[PDB]
Amino acid sequence: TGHSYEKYNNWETIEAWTKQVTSENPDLISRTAIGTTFLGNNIYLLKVGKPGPNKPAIFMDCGFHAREWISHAFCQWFVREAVLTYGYESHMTEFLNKLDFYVLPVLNIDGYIYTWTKNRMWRKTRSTNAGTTCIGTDPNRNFDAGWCTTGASTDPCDETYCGSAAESEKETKALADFIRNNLSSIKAYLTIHSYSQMILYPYSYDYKLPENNAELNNLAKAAVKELATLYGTKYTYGPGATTIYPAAGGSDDWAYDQGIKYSFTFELRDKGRYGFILPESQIQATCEETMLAIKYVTNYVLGHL
Numbered sequence: 001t002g003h004s005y006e007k008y009n010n011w012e013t014i015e016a017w018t019k020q021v022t023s024e025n026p027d028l029i030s031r032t033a034i035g036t037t038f039l040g041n042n043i044y045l046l047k048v049g050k051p052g053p054n055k056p057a058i059f060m061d062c063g064f065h066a067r068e069w070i071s072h073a074f075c076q077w078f079v080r081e082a083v084l085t086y087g088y089e090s091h092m093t094e095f096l097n098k099l100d101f102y103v104l105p106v107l108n109i110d111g112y113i114y115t116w117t118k119n120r121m122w123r124k125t126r127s128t129n130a131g132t133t134c135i136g137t138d139p140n141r142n143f144d145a146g147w148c149t150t151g152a153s154t155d156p157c158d159e160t161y162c163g164s165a166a167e168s169e170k171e172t173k174a175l176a177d178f179i180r181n182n183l184s185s186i187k188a189y190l191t192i193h194s195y196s197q198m199i200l201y202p203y204s205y206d207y208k209l210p211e212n213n214a215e216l217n218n219l220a221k222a223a224v225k226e227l228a229t230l231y232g233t234k235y236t237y238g239p240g241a242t243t244i245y246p247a248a249g250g251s252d253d254w255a256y257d258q259g260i261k262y263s264f265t266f267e268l269r270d271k272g273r274y275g276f277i278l279p280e281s282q283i284q285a286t287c288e289e290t291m292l293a294i295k296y297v298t299n300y301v302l303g304h305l
């Protein structure tokens with residue numbers, strides 16, 4: 001163990017922190033398991049906010065992809081910032097009073113442990129595939145959004161394997177189940193990744209645009225403007241297919257298709273110099289600037305209820 005917000009923490013440490021951060025803030029945090037990974041790890045979810053009746057929520061997950069360590073770190077950073085500024089910073093104070101932040105620290109816990117124990121560049125889950133020795137399904141290719149129709153491979157040996165079927169992975173099915181069971185309160189979906197420095201919105205499984213395309217563009221545009229204030233970090237934004245690439249089975253598209261109108265995929269630092277191996281020395285600056293974008297989007301969603 002040995003948790004730090006300016007260092008990448010292994011799963012043993014992250015799970016301990018989830019337990020500790022909750023015990024330390026009973027007034028603002030409630031911890032919950034929403035399923036288990038292929039290998040027996042508990043998929044924790046933290047409900048951040050001042051408890052109240054029938055509050056709306058914003059759902060944020062991190063750790064979809066094992067090697068994207070900066071995203072895991074961001075979920076942790078966010079949790080601390082939320083509790084230390086509550087009551088001192090008016091926006092965060094109003095956010096926690098009005099809505100609940102569902103923060104899922106790590107979805108792909110199994111693959112995360114693998115980047116720590118054997119392969120730093122692992123991406124997919126660690127599940128078994130019939131008829132092959134090849135391990136893993138790409139979790140952001142396993143959702144029911146034009147599933148496996150483009151930008152996904154049907155071969156288990158490929159890094160973008162779409163799974164045997166949609167929600168084949170316990171992790172994705174568990175995330176999907178949760179979102180389906182709380183659809184009523186969940187107003188926005190935020191999924192944290194790296195790298196590329198981008199804010200994306202639906203659709204990636206198709207070149208069609210969402211109904212609120214222009215609204216999402218204005219918002220993604222405003223958010224990137226916020227993030228840039230701190231250290232001049234430049235992000236690009238736009239619909240997935242044209243901004244990054246057509247890829248089916250993404251959770252952002254899926255959530256949008258559930259009715260969640262504000263759905264964004266965040267690609268954090270770098271642009272490629274360090275890529276997935278972003279120095280721990282950049283954790284704070286990265287998390288700081290990203291906080292401004294997330295809070296910007298939260299304030300918009302909130303003031304649009």
Ligand SMILES: N=C(N)Nc1cccc([C@@H](CS)C(=O)O)c1
Nearest residue numbers: 140193200204240244247250265
């Ligand atoms: N539906 C999508 N494919 N969305 C999507 C948008 C931006 C980045 C990605 C990456 C994140 S590593 C990825 O999952 O490969 C996916």
Ligand SMILES: [Zn+2]
Nearest residue numbers: 065068193194
């Ligand atoms: Zn990713």
